[PDB]
């Protein structure tokens, strides 16, 4: 009864325009509510006007040239172009323009879809470059850490407070009876701690979450039956998943 | 006979996936799907006509969303909802769906119209990419904290040098090894100014040769601003790349000899 297509265009989320090439300067003869919502204009502010008003300073002339060419050829076009809201706000317009021809092939109208793709072409790209920057920074900060621990030969370890998972420097591993590449946990260290010392170590390891620095003097018996006297100085980095940092030294020789 | 409908073509040529149903037919079936809809879903026209749009729902579809749609349709009210839908392939996508009733002049319901906008980038890729950026942001801060801790706890005389600029950072120990202020600005020249004349050239040649990335060692004397002769032993290595950073560890070996 009331054209389903007229209503489909009226109620769609897709900003849409219909122009009349037979009228001077191919003006807008229809803009749907979604278009007026995207741009901030009122119907009266866009009718009888060529769609050019969407272009501004940041608009690439090569893009305008491509559109001009396609319209003159009476050929469809898909282009991503910088356009401007009534506010002055720039946005990426994933534009589509299609000619409307009758059965004879007589050009009668032009139709368009204007999809704001700013998230894809601007936010997603800038967030992707922001993480590559942060990815290099982390690798550089790690390289600095690995250098100091190897050159200054520091027995440095990190421990995820809740998980228990550990990382161990080459020196930290040689202090205990560890393999250069074997995975370490607080349990791999506890397995070596002398029975008489086990409770104090579990006790100070739990009070790490406070963030205040501490010291732990304990003995170990290595997997090769060697009794070593250790002195550890630790501090937990507070936050979401606290990371306890510690430097271990083998104080056995002052005996 | 000659005037083709601009609206029929607008729907045909739009980038927006669109559906038209007939509530007067059993189960409110699809009576029209535009090429953009068939392109998004991977279906063929014949595979979607005469069918309720429900076939887009799957396991991950929230039943609360389906009830909101069922309710709005029954009320003959428009609806905007973000719902998990599925492509012919089985591929899950975020559908920013819109459904609107179509009423005639006497206000009689005649059709339902829709727009199905794939918003997966916004509700899924953007969210996961931010959660990923936060993670690295904390990691960077934690990696710095680890470095600052080692240099303070282990008493390390550690410095960094921007290869081209000469912009140097010194640790509190590095600063006490030379005759430096705890917060004064340090450059390779601030160090060179203290190096004994007899040693200056060996230091400058090795500093320029650092960019190779190959580690090196230097043993040189300094005379502090306080007139003290100190024997130093430095071990350095430049981190290669688009901006080389020279890392070095200085030790005061005067004590030894
Ligand atoms: C149906 C239709 C929709 C259009 N929509 C837009 C649009 O959203 N953004 C835009 O920058 N240009 C749009 N244009 C293009 C301009 O109206 C115009 O054709 C272009 O600026 C090239 O012509 P010119 O060099 O004479 O300005 C549209 C054109 C038509 C026919
Ligand atoms: C015009 C129109 C378009 C619809 N498009 C979708 C769609 O893209 N995705 C979807 O999950 N459901 C869509 N629906 C909703 C379902 O067809 C159905 O109404 C819903 O699953 C609730 O009814 P039910 O509980 O009987 O299944 C659409 C409904 C109408 C009327």
Author numbering:
A (entry chain A): 19 to 273
B (entry chain B): 17 to 273
Give the published text:
LOV-HK is a blue light photoreceptor from Brucella abortus, a pathogenic α-2-proteobacterium that can be transmitted from cattle to humans causing brucellosis. B. abortus LOV-HK comprises an N-terminal blue light-sensing LOV domain, a central PAS (Per-Arnt-Sim) domain of unknown function and a C-terminal HK domain. Upon blue light illumination, B. abortus LOV-HK photobleaches as a result of the adduct formation between its flavin mononucleotide (FMN) chromophore and an adjacent conserved cysteine residue as in other LOV proteins.
We have determined the crystal structure of LOV-PAS in the dark-adapted state at 2.74 Å resolution. The chromophore environment in the LOV-PAS structure is consistent with the dark structures of B. abortus LOV domains and other LOV proteins, where the FMN ligand is clearly separated from the protein moiety in the electron density map (left). In each dimer, the LOV domains, the linker helices, and the PAS domains from the partner subunits are juxtaposed along the extensive dimer interface. At the dimer interface, two long Jα helices (residues 135 to 171) consisting of five heptad repeats form an extensive coiled coil via mainly hydrophobic interactions. The CD dimer exhibits slightly higher asymmetry than the AB dimer. In the dark LOV structure, the isoalloxazine moiety of FMN forms extensive H-bonds with the conserved Asn101/Asn111 and Gln132 residues, while its phosphate group extends out between the Eα and Fα helices.
